[PDB]
Amino acid sequence: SVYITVELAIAVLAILGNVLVCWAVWLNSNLQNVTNYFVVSLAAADILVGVLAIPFAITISTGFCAACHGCLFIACFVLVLAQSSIFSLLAIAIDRYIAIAIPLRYNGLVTGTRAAGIIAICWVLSFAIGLTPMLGWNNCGQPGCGEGQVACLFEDVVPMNYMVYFNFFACVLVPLLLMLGVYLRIFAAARRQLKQMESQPLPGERARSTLQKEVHAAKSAAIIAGLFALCWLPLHIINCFTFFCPDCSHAPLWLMYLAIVLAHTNSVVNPFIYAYRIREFRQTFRKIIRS
Ligand SMILES: Nc1nc(NCCc2ccc(O)cc2)nc2nc(-c3ccco3)nn12
């Protein structure tokens, strides 16, 4: 019960923090742009974490008895929310890129409609991937609870060749490498703009000020995606240790818990990172609380 509380504590903060981020975008129309449409997808996702993921994660911890479908769901649901966030964070990455790179075509391309469409597909593909073990790629009955029900234990029910080759390497590592690659060009061309506006026979502080803020938002976005990888890589690397190195000390349960917990923490930093990196956001939250 010493660690049980921690998981619940995180669940609460995850719900409040993001429901606040969602309500703030519903009151302040100065946040209701195409960009923040994806932010909500990330928020709503990190909300279902403290609402479902954590409640599930803490359940399958001690293990239980239920069918394969029911078990795999309570075991692969967290893979969905995390996978959805992969799409969102990648979207935001491309978003800030289109804005800084092609400011004019930004409005003609990055529309509020296409935003909704993408988000929808992101979740659809999020379930297709996150629940792949349910498609048949699972270990239900691969050497108590009686016929029908299965001893719902993560390691015994969820494949490793999947969460490594498929999940991590492809559906997480590759995206992060793409996201990284994006922010590479973003901050690369951004400073080129400042260089071109340095040899100009005119002030034009409108371009500079606006750009520096488009960059400020891009940087703030980079800090968001950065925390994700920083709060998931540990758990994934562990899976690579247990998998690729069978003789290597199988990660301890206590260290395994800590690592798994860290992932549940990524659903809490976003609210605080907005109220910190975004002056527009913090002022909105302040209004809500006071009033
Ligand atoms: N190797 C491994 N073992 C387990 N075992 C379940 C142990 C456990 C489960 C829940 C909890 O709160 C504390 C401990 N869960 C695991 N979850 C993950 C994981 C999730 C996302 C990426 O890796 N890997 N993994």
Tab-separated table of C-alpha atoms and ligand atoms in Angstrom:
chain	number	residue	atom	x	y	z
A	1	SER	CA	0.000	0.000	0.000
A	2	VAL	CA	3.110	2.187	0.158
A	3	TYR	CA	3.237	2.573	-3.625
A	4	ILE	CA	-0.496	2.130	-4.189
A	5	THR	CA	-1.143	5.678	-2.981
A	6	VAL	CA	1.449	7.115	-5.371
A	7	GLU	CA	-0.390	5.645	-8.360
A	8	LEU	CA	-3.678	7.099	-7.111
A	9	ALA	CA	-2.090	10.468	-6.343
A	10	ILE	CA	-0.778	10.652	-9.905
A	11	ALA	CA	-4.206	9.624	-11.201
A	12	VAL	CA	-5.850	12.589	-9.479
A	13	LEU	CA	-3.326	15.192	-10.634
A	14	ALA	CA	-3.505	13.748	-14.150
A	15	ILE	CA	-7.278	14.197	-14.249
A	16	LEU	CA	-7.396	17.679	-12.713
A	17	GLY	CA	-4.398	19.044	-14.599
A	18	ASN	CA	-5.759	18.061	-18.007
A	19	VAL	CA	-9.467	18.639	-17.391
A	20	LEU	CA	-8.258	22.123	-16.497
A	21	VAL	CA	-6.306	22.344	-19.751
A	22	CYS	CA	-9.483	21.300	-21.565
A	23	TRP	CA	-11.812	23.693	-19.737
A	24	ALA	CA	-9.337	26.531	-20.260
A	25	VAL	CA	-9.505	26.003	-24.019
A	26	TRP	CA	-13.293	26.006	-23.754
A	27	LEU	CA	-13.420	29.386	-22.006
A	28	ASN	CA	-10.566	31.243	-23.690
A	29	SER	CA	-11.151	31.491	-27.443
A	30	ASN	CA	-7.585	32.760	-27.825
A	31	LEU	CA	-6.521	29.144	-27.353
A	32	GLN	CA	-9.147	27.636	-29.648
A	33	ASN	CA	-6.891	27.475	-32.705
A	34	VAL	CA	-6.071	24.539	-34.985
A	35	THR	CA	-2.876	23.830	-33.038
A	36	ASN	CA	-4.603	23.311	-29.693
A	37	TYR	CA	-7.087	20.943	-31.320
A	38	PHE	CA	-4.361	18.302	-31.102
A	39	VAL	CA	-3.374	19.449	-27.612
A	40	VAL	CA	-6.848	18.405	-26.481
A	41	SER	CA	-6.293	14.982	-28.048
A	42	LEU	CA	-3.148	14.696	-25.934
A	43	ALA	CA	-4.969	16.004	-22.864
A	44	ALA	CA	-8.044	13.790	-23.212
A	45	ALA	CA	-5.611	10.913	-23.677
A	46	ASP	CA	-3.591	11.669	-20.546
A	47	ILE	CA	-6.955	12.029	-18.799
A	48	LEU	CA	-8.041	8.474	-19.583
A	49	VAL	CA	-4.734	7.465	-18.014
A	50	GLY	CA	-5.631	8.462	-14.464
A	51	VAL	CA	-9.218	7.444	-15.168
A	52	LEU	CA	-8.628	4.044	-16.777
A	53	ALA	CA	-4.954	3.226	-17.368
A	54	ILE	CA	-3.804	3.712	-13.771
A	55	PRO	CA	-6.888	1.957	-12.352
A	56	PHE	CA	-6.128	-0.903	-14.757
A	57	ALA	CA	-2.355	-0.840	-14.299
A	58	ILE	CA	-2.787	-1.142	-10.535
A	59	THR	CA	-5.223	-4.026	-11.031
A	60	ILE	CA	-3.192	-6.228	-13.376
A	61	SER	CA	-0.316	-5.589	-10.970
A	62	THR	CA	-1.600	-8.195	-8.524
A	63	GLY	CA	-3.122	-10.120	-11.425
A	64	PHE	CA	-6.647	-11.495	-11.726
A	65	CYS	CA	-8.810	-14.049	-13.533
A	66	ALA	CA	-10.730	-13.189	-16.703
A	67	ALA	CA	-11.155	-14.086	-20.379
A	68	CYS	CA	-8.525	-13.304	-23.014
A	69	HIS	CA	-10.375	-10.340	-24.524
A	70	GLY	CA	-11.154	-8.775	-21.156
A	71	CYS	CA	-7.611	-9.379	-19.930
A	72	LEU	CA	-5.779	-8.125	-23.025
A	73	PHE	CA	-7.907	-4.973	-22.969
A	74	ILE	CA	-7.049	-4.155	-19.356
A	75	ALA	CA	-3.442	-4.875	-20.329
A	76	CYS	CA	-3.140	-3.174	-23.721
A	77	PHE	CA	-5.368	-0.151	-23.111
A	78	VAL	CA	-2.392	1.839	-21.830
A	79	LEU	CA	-0.655	1.056	-25.120
A	80	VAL	CA	-3.485	2.865	-26.898
A	81	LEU	CA	-3.408	6.128	-24.937
A	82	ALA	CA	0.378	6.191	-25.279
A	83	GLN	CA	0.158	5.445	-29.005
A	84	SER	CA	-2.431	8.170	-29.547
A	85	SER	CA	-0.085	10.625	-27.843
A	86	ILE	CA	2.538	9.516	-30.360
A	87	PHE	CA	0.316	10.749	-33.185
A	88	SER	CA	-0.578	14.001	-31.425
A	89	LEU	CA	2.991	14.920	-30.471
A	90	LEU	CA	4.060	14.117	-34.029
A	91	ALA	CA	1.241	16.279	-35.383
A	92	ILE	CA	2.164	19.255	-33.199
A	93	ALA	CA	5.753	18.799	-34.356
A	94	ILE	CA	4.735	19.051	-38.010
A	95	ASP	CA	2.283	21.825	-37.144
A	96	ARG	CA	4.829	24.231	-35.663
A	97	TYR	CA	7.020	23.312	-38.627
A	98	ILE	CA	4.435	24.333	-41.226
A	99	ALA	CA	3.850	27.606	-39.380
A	100	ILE	CA	7.511	28.615	-39.147
A	101	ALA	CA	8.465	27.183	-42.542
A	102	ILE	CA	5.461	28.210	-44.636
A	103	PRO	CA	3.462	30.840	-42.687
A	104	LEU	CA	1.264	31.665	-45.691
A	105	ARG	CA	0.287	28.108	-46.631
A	106	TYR	CA	-0.093	27.341	-42.924
A	107	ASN	CA	-3.677	28.610	-42.938
A	108	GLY	CA	-4.566	27.040	-46.280
A	109	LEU	CA	-3.216	23.672	-45.158
A	110	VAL	CA	-3.421	23.468	-41.365
A	111	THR	CA	-7.192	23.898	-41.088
A	112	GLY	CA	-9.488	23.236	-38.136
A	113	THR	CA	-11.260	20.565	-40.171
A	114	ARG	CA	-8.190	18.583	-41.219
A	115	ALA	CA	-7.162	18.783	-37.567
A	116	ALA	CA	-10.315	16.956	-36.485
A	117	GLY	CA	-9.961	14.436	-39.304
A	118	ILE	CA	-6.366	13.587	-38.440
A	119	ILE	CA	-7.168	13.315	-34.731
A	120	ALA	CA	-9.942	10.833	-35.525
A	121	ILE	CA	-7.658	8.682	-37.674
A	122	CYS	CA	-4.967	8.925	-35.001
A	123	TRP	CA	-7.264	7.332	-32.419
A	124	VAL	CA	-8.572	4.737	-34.873
A	125	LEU	CA	-5.011	3.713	-35.718
A	126	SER	CA	-4.217	4.048	-32.015
A	127	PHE	CA	-6.593	1.199	-31.171
A	128	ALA	CA	-5.489	-0.843	-34.183
A	129	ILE	CA	-1.898	-0.748	-32.937
A	130	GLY	CA	-2.346	-0.484	-29.174
A	131	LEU	CA	-4.674	-3.484	-29.200
A	132	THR	CA	-2.732	-5.578	-31.720
A	133	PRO	CA	-2.132	-8.299	-29.098
A	134	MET	CA	-5.925	-8.679	-29.079
A	135	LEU	CA	-5.939	-9.315	-32.829
A	136	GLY	CA	-4.362	-12.688	-32.084
A	137	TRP	CA	-0.743	-11.725	-31.468
A	138	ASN	CA	-0.927	-12.762	-27.807
A	139	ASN	CA	0.138	-15.418	-25.297
A	140	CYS	CA	-3.201	-16.588	-23.909
A	141	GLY	CA	-2.489	-20.143	-22.781
A	142	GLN	CA	1.195	-20.403	-23.646
A	143	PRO	CA	3.055	-22.254	-20.845
A	144	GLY	CA	-6.056	-21.802	-11.138
A	145	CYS	CA	-8.801	-19.795	-12.826
A	146	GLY	CA	-10.639	-22.624	-14.570
A	147	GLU	CA	-11.329	-23.049	-18.279
A	148	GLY	CA	-12.193	-19.852	-20.133
A	149	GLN	CA	-10.509	-17.431	-17.740
A	150	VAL	CA	-6.769	-16.740	-17.866
A	151	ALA	CA	-4.334	-15.727	-15.128
A	152	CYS	CA	-4.149	-12.104	-16.252
A	153	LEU	CA	-0.455	-11.320	-15.870
A	154	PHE	CA	1.197	-8.761	-18.145
A	155	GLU	CA	4.405	-10.692	-18.847
A	156	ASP	CA	2.622	-14.013	-19.401
A	157	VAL	CA	-0.222	-12.679	-21.548
A	158	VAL	CA	1.491	-9.952	-23.584
A	159	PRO	CA	4.156	-10.978	-26.151
A	160	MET	CA	7.676	-9.536	-25.995
A	161	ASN	CA	8.519	-9.876	-29.686
A	162	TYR	CA	5.543	-7.569	-30.186
A	163	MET	CA	6.190	-4.810	-27.650
A	164	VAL	CA	9.786	-4.672	-28.863
A	165	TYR	CA	9.938	-5.193	-32.631
A	166	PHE	CA	6.456	-3.826	-33.320
A	167	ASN	CA	5.353	-1.500	-30.512
A	168	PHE	CA	8.554	0.165	-29.281
A	169	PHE	CA	10.957	0.076	-32.239
A	170	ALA	CA	8.376	0.949	-34.897
A	171	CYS	CA	5.385	2.613	-33.239
A	172	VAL	CA	7.404	4.635	-30.720
A	173	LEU	CA	11.117	4.781	-31.539
A	174	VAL	CA	10.617	5.590	-35.226
A	175	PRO	CA	8.098	8.373	-34.494
A	176	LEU	CA	10.416	9.937	-31.897
A	177	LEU	CA	13.153	9.839	-34.532
A	178	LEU	CA	10.780	11.601	-36.924
A	179	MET	CA	9.671	14.141	-34.322
A	180	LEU	CA	13.314	14.801	-33.485
A	181	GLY	CA	14.043	15.128	-37.196
A	182	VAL	CA	11.264	17.692	-37.532
A	183	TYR	CA	12.381	19.957	-34.685
A	184	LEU	CA	15.801	19.701	-36.330
A	185	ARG	CA	14.624	21.523	-39.450
A	186	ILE	CA	12.309	23.812	-37.478
A	187	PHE	CA	15.016	25.355	-35.300
A	188	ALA	CA	17.409	25.136	-38.250
A	189	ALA	CA	15.372	27.288	-40.631
A	190	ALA	CA	14.022	29.460	-37.811
A	191	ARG	CA	17.488	30.863	-37.130
A	192	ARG	CA	17.951	31.260	-40.883
A	193	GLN	CA	14.940	33.574	-40.894
A	194	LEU	CA	16.506	35.692	-38.152
A	195	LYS	CA	19.632	35.751	-40.316
A	196	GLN	CA	17.757	36.998	-43.382
A	197	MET	CA	15.963	39.614	-41.286
A	198	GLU	CA	19.357	40.753	-40.017
A	199	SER	CA	20.494	42.172	-43.356
A	200	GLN	CA	17.253	44.044	-44.035
A	201	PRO	CA	17.141	47.779	-44.920
A	202	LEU	CA	14.138	48.082	-42.588
A	203	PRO	CA	13.128	47.427	-38.947
A	204	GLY	CA	10.132	45.139	-39.460
A	205	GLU	CA	9.942	44.063	-35.825
A	206	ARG	CA	6.539	42.572	-36.620
A	207	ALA	CA	8.235	39.671	-38.399
A	208	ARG	CA	10.862	39.215	-35.689
A	209	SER	CA	8.477	39.428	-32.731
A	210	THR	CA	5.933	37.135	-34.390
A	211	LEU	CA	8.609	34.658	-35.478
A	212	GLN	CA	10.292	34.578	-32.067
A	213	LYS	CA	6.885	33.674	-30.644
A	214	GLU	CA	6.206	31.011	-33.269
A	215	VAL	CA	9.598	29.651	-32.243
A	216	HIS	CA	8.738	30.054	-28.562
A	217	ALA	CA	5.671	27.885	-29.155
A	218	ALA	CA	7.702	25.390	-31.183
A	219	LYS	CA	10.308	25.183	-28.423
A	220	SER	CA	7.594	24.783	-25.798
A	221	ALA	CA	6.241	21.994	-27.999
A	222	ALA	CA	9.679	20.380	-28.180
A	223	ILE	CA	9.839	20.383	-24.382
A	224	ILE	CA	6.528	18.512	-24.324
A	225	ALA	CA	7.583	15.761	-26.729
A	226	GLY	CA	10.941	15.593	-24.969
A	227	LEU	CA	9.384	14.718	-21.621
A	228	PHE	CA	7.389	11.932	-23.269
A	229	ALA	CA	10.448	10.048	-24.517
A	230	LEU	CA	12.183	10.846	-21.229
A	231	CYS	CA	9.273	9.236	-19.373
A	232	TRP	CA	8.961	6.107	-21.524
A	233	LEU	CA	12.413	5.155	-22.824
A	234	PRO	CA	13.439	3.697	-19.436
A	235	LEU	CA	10.563	1.198	-19.482
A	236	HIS	CA	11.202	0.347	-23.136
A	237	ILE	CA	14.953	-0.066	-22.663
A	238	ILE	CA	14.150	-2.495	-19.858
A	239	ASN	CA	12.027	-4.523	-22.273
A	240	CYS	CA	15.042	-4.573	-24.586
A	241	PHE	CA	17.199	-5.826	-21.714
A	242	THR	CA	14.851	-8.661	-20.767
A	243	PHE	CA	14.296	-9.537	-24.429
A	244	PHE	CA	17.610	-9.214	-26.271
A	245	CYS	CA	19.581	-10.294	-23.201
A	246	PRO	CA	17.974	-13.431	-21.685
A	247	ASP	CA	20.926	-14.043	-19.357
A	248	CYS	CA	20.985	-10.397	-18.259
A	249	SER	CA	19.461	-9.853	-14.817
A	250	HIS	CA	15.719	-9.693	-15.449
A	251	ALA	CA	14.738	-6.234	-14.211
A	252	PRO	CA	13.629	-6.333	-10.539
A	253	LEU	CA	9.935	-5.816	-9.766
A	254	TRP	CA	10.661	-2.757	-7.624
A	255	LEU	CA	12.729	-1.124	-10.366
A	256	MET	CA	10.127	-2.341	-12.850
A	257	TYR	CA	7.415	-0.587	-10.843
A	258	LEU	CA	9.383	2.659	-10.692
A	259	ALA	CA	9.926	2.514	-14.457
A	260	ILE	CA	6.254	1.796	-15.142
A	261	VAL	CA	5.252	4.581	-12.754
A	262	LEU	CA	7.397	7.107	-14.624
A	263	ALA	CA	5.224	6.521	-17.694
A	264	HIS	CA	2.097	7.350	-15.691
A	265	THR	CA	3.789	10.624	-14.749
A	266	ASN	CA	3.982	11.883	-18.338
A	267	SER	CA	0.237	12.507	-18.062
A	268	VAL	CA	0.749	15.287	-15.514
A	269	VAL	CA	3.639	17.481	-16.678
A	270	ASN	CA	1.775	18.921	-19.672
A	271	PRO	CA	-0.671	21.055	-17.653
A	272	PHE	CA	2.182	22.448	-15.552
A	273	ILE	CA	4.320	22.970	-18.659
A	274	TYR	CA	1.583	25.054	-20.273
A	275	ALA	CA	0.991	27.147	-17.163
A	276	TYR	CA	4.754	27.717	-17.255
A	277	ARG	CA	5.888	27.942	-20.883
A	278	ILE	CA	2.702	29.631	-22.087
A	279	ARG	CA	1.819	33.053	-20.689
A	280	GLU	CA	-1.568	32.889	-22.408
A	281	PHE	CA	-2.364	29.574	-20.714
A	282	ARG	CA	-1.334	30.437	-17.150
A	283	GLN	CA	-3.508	33.563	-17.096
A	284	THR	CA	-6.486	31.482	-18.207
A	285	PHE	CA	-6.014	28.876	-15.476
A	286	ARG	CA	-5.617	31.655	-12.910
A	287	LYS	CA	-9.052	32.987	-13.866
A	288	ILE	CA	-10.710	29.589	-13.455
A	289	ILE	CA	-9.328	28.872	-9.982
A	290	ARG	CA	-9.964	32.336	-8.540
A	291	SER	CA	-13.460	32.361	-10.036
B	1	LIG	N1	8.082	-6.176	-18.551
B	1	LIG	C1	6.921	-5.774	-17.951
B	1	LIG	N2	6.356	-6.393	-16.888
B	1	LIG	C2	5.184	-5.899	-16.365
B	1	LIG	N3	4.709	-6.608	-15.299
B	1	LIG	C3	3.645	-6.167	-14.414
B	1	LIG	C4	4.183	-5.767	-13.037
B	1	LIG	C5	3.476	-4.541	-12.516
B	1	LIG	C6	2.288	-4.101	-13.122
B	1	LIG	C7	1.628	-2.964	-12.651
B	1	LIG	C8	2.157	-2.265	-11.572
B	1	LIG	O1	1.542	-1.149	-11.078
B	1	LIG	C9	3.334	-2.688	-10.959
B	1	LIG	C10	3.995	-3.824	-11.430
B	1	LIG	N4	4.481	-4.809	-16.807
B	1	LIG	C11	5.026	-4.173	-17.868
B	1	LIG	N5	4.536	-3.036	-18.533
B	1	LIG	C12	5.416	-2.778	-19.519
B	1	LIG	C13	5.325	-1.674	-20.498
B	1	LIG	C14	4.238	-0.843	-20.687
B	1	LIG	C15	4.587	0.060	-21.723
B	1	LIG	C16	5.864	-0.273	-22.109
B	1	LIG	O2	6.319	-1.320	-21.377
B	1	LIG	N6	6.445	-3.710	-19.505
B	1	LIG	N7	6.193	-4.610	-18.440
